[PDB]
Ligand binder design. Structure first.
Ligand SMILES: O=c1ccn([C@@H]2O[C@H](COP(=O)(O)OP(=O)(O)O)[C@@H](O)[C@H]2O)c(=O)[nH]1
Ligand SMILES: OC[C@@H](O)[C@@H](O)CO
Lengths: 505, 503, 502, 505
């Protein structure tokens, strides 16, 4: 007999695992517990803070939801109106000295007239071929060309996507992108060129809310707090080291054994295969591809510059900077950085020089958060990436050479993006059903490795729906039908369902 | 305070309501009851029997859901509760029994027609190569799939006889998301090879209850319910629905309070019982056909010309029925034993039998369907005789065949019609009922034919309860293509909830 | 026996008949003569002159044939017999002079219209990508080339004003074999770049006679013929054609016997002169428009707003003419020299001049065309004033401009219409004439507009003779696309036959 | 001064040169003469006769005409009704032991059913692709696949055309084929499959006439006889050895020099370049391609076998025989072979063995004429080709092993077909204008090298039109617009034109 026995064991307390725990806690039938190796729940949605008081999320995380269930849990976790700030998505692409409104491919009107010709010509070619197309594109690259033409592919989509994914567009599938990549309408794009108009409203994150305090990680701390503490085991005491799938036993770092009837595993599936000592699965998971993410944070002295304005996040296809995205993180909340009266010395100027004095001066302060991708196809010099990012900020005119930097941050996250390679689905259909036959629900950004359902709301619901499948026979819609859940308002499942209403009578 | 109070009230014990009841009974959380005005559960999936002992259903099953299978296996668990058959169907066309699907078997038609059919399908294939719109009417869908020549021979005249409306007046989304395009190579190849081939075989089968017909399933399913939570018969006839008070009043005066209502009666009747004039006007804008079911019991061994045929399609105008079923092929117990003695009522040509004496069998049995609507009236007094003449005209019966039993019943609400206007009307009705905590679901509860056969209907009830209790998506109601194109294996009659509770 | 007998008789001394005569005179084998009821050769390519000294043609030459060039160079051999100009043309649209071709220059229009035009051309380009039929009407051809928006702005309303029938009633084979499809990229590129570009330049030119207008060519060409083989004037008016006896009767009673007839008169007149009621019935089923030519002589140096413009198109309804020609740009001698004194007849707004004194020039000159048909009547008594008002409306003239000369003439047979029914009717007429050894050829001799300008017409006559004498294919008559798509260099005014004979 | 001076010199008295001569003689203006190195005019349209009395043409030459002028000249030369025999074209493709009516691609209905499926499937694919085609095919092969589908390409068109052209279909252009290769209508071909019907009437040679005596060569002897004898120079006395294009002088083998003003050269253009000692022209003509043709003749004892019947010519795509075509030459005229009373010994049996008797026996006789192609891409064993053909006749069941052969014939024609290679036009537009600038009209099957206007009537009219261009400024329509002249009735030019009618008064 093992030390602990539960019906459902949840590994991981990021959004996916916390979703599973919330649904298990709501249903309150089968016994359960949740474990994580970090004392602070949140996974890749956690928030760091520099010694100078600048918060940085793991990547430009904004909250936007396809599911009422997710909303219920965030509102339960952070119920006050001043727990949240709402913002319009202000997003731009840096191109040839200009800020081009997102989506690029729908704002060709902003480029020089000569580039407009190249872009529209390519889009005419794509539209004529699309009129007689009877096949689907097989690669991300073919999709880009078929729906945008070469001109826009060469100017933006191809170089940008290598900088994000750390693989070329030719190496990725294209089924994942229904909700991420705008395919442009020839008439709408040409009309806006003729009229000199913009169109910034495309996509599901065109409006968002951001927590007032604690960054994204504050959400998941607050969510986890609603759980019965005795059903949680966070820290080294909850680090999983062995998974014995045949005995349905998990061994923790401190030697605690947990027997389960059903396992919801949200750790990276390649880690799970190793913890299972299952060489067949290790070999299979090693056929998946992922990129690492470097997050760089730069805290700057001064009131928010006019050139920055209300910008939220920014795309950088060009090779004059290492990062693919910048976030004006100080626009998301005033509490992402110190108050104006906080006194801080200048660590360096944006041009790399040292300040003359160690004098601590007051603010106000603003803050830039940058992301750089790394993979076996795209190495990154870890020792210089911070300075290269700051120089990239000067190259893109986001910082003046004289700007005073008062705080820096750099962290590398090994599993950053699960890559939608051409091979992903073929490998996953060998991995996930084999785990399924052992009553292991491997779910999450790296639990099930599908980026298109790898956001905080999708991840949360992957855990929710996994539990719903275990307990109530529910379809795991998010796991297997991203287009289906992304194309509808998912209103049916609530934090208080009929089951709980009728039981309380 | 009302006489009875339950969390969830289910009106109707046809497949839809029994699905709702089966899921409520499985969940065993909220209180509930199910009512029906008929003492026998089954609704429009019941089975009648003539005084001579021939059964007639109002039905072939194909299940898209493990949950449905679980409930049927629970109700009828023994292997000899069922007979399995291949899905053998033919189209009657110009003196020929053409295997279904029609287009793969035009080699049986005269060569001049094969030319016209292939030429039309070539046109459709070339058009499909440059098509960039979806078809808007059932008729356009037919033509794009088949071409003019093949369309005119079968699907156009047959579907008028089925729906009692012309194909140009029906929508086509209810048929699925598949692109309307011909398989030209498959059709020409069979013409070139001079072959026929039906879409059945050892893989393509159905099973049918050994006894009691289709209605036997639903009796057996209903028997698994706690009898005290059921109220079937005149004592369970609903006469008033007060949506504002969440009260139902029965014919005997009993009032039932509910928190959520699952109504499987026809939504136009529901609107009337609600005394909701707005919904009455809206529901009267829906369209439906009535169905005449005709049953004919025949003396004799099964003729060779009938053989293993199961159901048959009739596009041509030499018979009033659109479909015939060799119902005696579904079970030996759909008709009397060979030793049962019965007199001949008439010969197939209408003449009197030579003798009035009762003679022995064996017997076989034909079930026919005729549609009726304001665009296609039916003479109730002569339709039986017209059907029998149609059996002679189609060579299903010889003039000398001995008829030993007849059956004719008219069902007022027979098919909910997928008109062009259906969805515009339903999207005004269903949300107004939903805002009153009324789940109106089923063949005429929600009026969508494509989810109105037995397995879909049952699951409409199951998923309605699952939505009420567990927040499930009602996938069958709103996404028929989605559920039909996948393996619906997740939901079971024993879910994890019940497993974990039992230990 | 008739009064005169020749192997080949030519009726008409416009370009077509003069082509026949030139080839006959070059071959110098079979006997021949040419007649015309006018004392001056040239037909509908003649030139009138107003009493005030302004020339107006009945204009611009593009030659597909070296043979035609040889004859023009023989007739007018000096370099100063001709002036060369670029082919500068514009479409008047919504207050703008839009360079031809219209669709490459819509950037001059309001942005909302550019959107409508480009959207329509996108629709047309996508339909052209899956097209598998040919257009059946001129209208369908226009829409497939241009899209709805651009069609509605120029080619649809303009061609009604030209042909006096709607575009839906005309065939479109007469335009050539080129596929009816848009150049979407070219049109969008000029919109994106905000550019204009006309289809002219240093090598897209035409030449025009220095003196005597277009009519000077045909006088000079006819002068190279042996005078005794010509019969021009009332003495050459044909009044009867007896196709069975192969006899022509002239107005003065002279009878001419022929073995082969090249008739360049209008085929409906020919059927009447033949007293062939069947052919009268068939020819009366052909359709044609009448043409009013209006000329306006203006005092002053050429205004900057006019500039180097040559001819102009008018789709809009603020003027009755479909075409205007800056005829004073074609030659300085199309109008009086600057020292010529002329009184002002009226101002462009219709008012009277302050003085009736004759004042000096210089002068410039506008030539206008208005169409007329049973589907589009024209008031003969007011059309001149309507044209002048149209010149004000289109800003070609300011209200104050001084008009010193006017000209108005109506030509009953102006354009032979490429209706849908034309070919069905012609293929019954021409073979019936051919069986009687009558080659009916020319703008109205054979009624095909696309080979009815000067070089095609001339070559219709040349090729008819070459067919009569040498068994040549009449390529221009039956294969316009063929002759228009090649350099027709083989036939020369001096062929091997004449070289070897000398 | 040269020995002779004429305005127009014609080299060659095949159909092309005789056309030039006939038009020059009709016009009767410029002085002229015609030379040929063979005493018998006719060129590649000549007729040989074996010692046993069997006539064989060069190829399966049959007369079918696009021009009234050509008809006028044939009717003048052979004016009596019994100078000619008229025949329906009975033509078949030997395919898998069966005779499939020509054209093959329109008679799919005759093949085994499994092959009909493959053929119709291929045409369906082609028809759907053709529905969205917006480019023209560039090679003969691409044309075949586009208009016929793979099944018919792989079954017939690809192997037969290699067997004829001695180059693969991928190496040929496709502008030449309008009147040679039937493009199948999908509906017509499918309809005939369904109905079990045939459609053997396609093409300009569905009917033909053949001279009663002397074979095809009898025509050209008779046409040449209408010329004034003193303006002809046929034989070794008329062999051209040097052409001095700069002096406009031709030197004959016997040393005679002829001065000309215009040259109509109908010898092979590569021979002309060699005779000109113009190395530039030699190099260009060597870039042209041609195949050689072997004509094999077999005289057979017996009344015409039932299996042969009224067949005229036959196609052999398969590898059980070396010839691509067989002609039942004895069906063209009874005077192509000896009368029945002629006594001839059996030379061999068709199986190669010696006859039982050497004694001369009577007829009747019939006669087979075979064609085998040769090129640098398709070598041929010259020494065994006669025996290989006879064995192929047995293999194809045209001869029984016991059939008695009474006469054999084999002749190789070095210049047999001018190949429509992809490079042909690019080379010709360098050759023909360069010769044109020297007043040399190089015209004919190998004079101008265009197979699509390489038949007897096209060749004749090339000579006629060259003269008409030299004298009357006529367009050389046949040379430059094969589709134009092949698609119309060329009725305008006659042997008696208006010029001559008016002159005779
Ligand atoms: O059944 C057939 C037989 C021939 N050909 C084509 O017709 C062309 C001309 O062949 P033909 O026998 O008519 O003339 P020849 O080879 O003697 O010049 C050939 O190259 C073939 O590709 C064809 O398409 N289908
Ligand atoms: O000789 C008459 C001939 O050229 C015309 O009929 C062509 O149409």
């Amino acid at each position: 007999h093992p030390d602990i026995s539960v019906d459902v064991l949840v590994i991981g307390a990021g959004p996916t695992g916390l979703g599973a725990a919330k649904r298990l806690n709501q249903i309150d039938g089968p016994s359960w517990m949740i474990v994580d190796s970090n004392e602070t729940p949140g996974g890749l949605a956690s928030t760091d803070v520099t010694p100078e008081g600048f918060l940085y999320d793991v990547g430009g995380a904004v909250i936007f939801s396809h599911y009422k269930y997710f909303d219920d849990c965030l509102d339960e976790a952070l119920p006050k109106e001043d727990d949240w700030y709402t913002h319009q998505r202000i997003s731009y692409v840096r191109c040839q000295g200009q800020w081009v409104p997102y989506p690029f491919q729908n704002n060709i009107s902003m480029l020089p007239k000569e580039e407009q010709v190249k872009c529209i010509d390519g889009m005419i070619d794509a539209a004529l071929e699309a009129r007689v197309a009877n096949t689907k594109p097989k690669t991300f690259d073919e999709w880009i060309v078929r729906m945008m033409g070469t001109g826009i592919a060469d100017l933006f989509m191809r170089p940008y996507n290598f900088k994000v994914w750390a693989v070329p567009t030719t190496k990725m599938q294209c089924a994942w992108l229904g909700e991420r990549v705008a395919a442009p309408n020839l008439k709408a794009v040409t009309t806006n060129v003729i009229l000199g108009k913009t169109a910034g409203n495309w996509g599901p994150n065109a409006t968002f809310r951001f927590p007032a305090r604690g960054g994204t990680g504050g959400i998941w701390i607050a969510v986890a707090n609603t759980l019965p503490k005795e059903k949680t085991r966070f820290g080294e005491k909850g680090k999983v080291t062995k998974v014995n799938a045949n005995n349905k036993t998990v061994t923790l770092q401190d030697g605690t054994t947990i027997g389960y009837k059903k396992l919801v595993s949200t750790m990276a599936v390649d880690f799970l295969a190793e913890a299972m000592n299952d060489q067949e699965l290790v070999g299979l998971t090693k056929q998946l591809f992922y990129s690492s993410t470097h997050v760089i944070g730069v805290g700057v002295r001064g009131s928010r510059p006019e050139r920055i304005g209300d910008k939220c996040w920014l795309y950088f296809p060009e090779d004059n900077c290492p990062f693919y995205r910048a976030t004006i993180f100080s626009n998301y909340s005033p509490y992402n950085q110190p108050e104006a009266s906080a006194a801080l010395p200048t660590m360096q100027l944006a041009d790399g020089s040292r300040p003359q004095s160690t004098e601590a001066k007051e603010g106000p302060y603003w803050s830039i958060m940058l992301e750089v991708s790394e993979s076996s196809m795209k190495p990154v010099n870890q020792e210089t990436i911070l300075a290269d990012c700051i120089q990239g900020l000067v190259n893109t005119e986001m910082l003046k050479p004289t700007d005073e930097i008062v705080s820096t941050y750099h962290r590398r996250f090994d599993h950053g993006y699960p890559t939608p390679t051409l091979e992903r689905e073929g490998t996953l259909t060998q991995i996930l059903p084999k785990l399924q036959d052992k009553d292991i629900w491997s779910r999450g950004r790296f639990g099930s490795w599908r980026y298109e359902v790898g956001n905080q709301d999708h991840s949360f619901m992957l855990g929710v729906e996994a539990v719903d499948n275990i307990v109530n026979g529910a379809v795991e819609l998010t796991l297997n039908y991203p287009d289906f859940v992304n194309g509808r308002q998912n209103t049916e499942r609530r934090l208080v369902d009929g089951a709980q209403v009728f039981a309380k009578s």
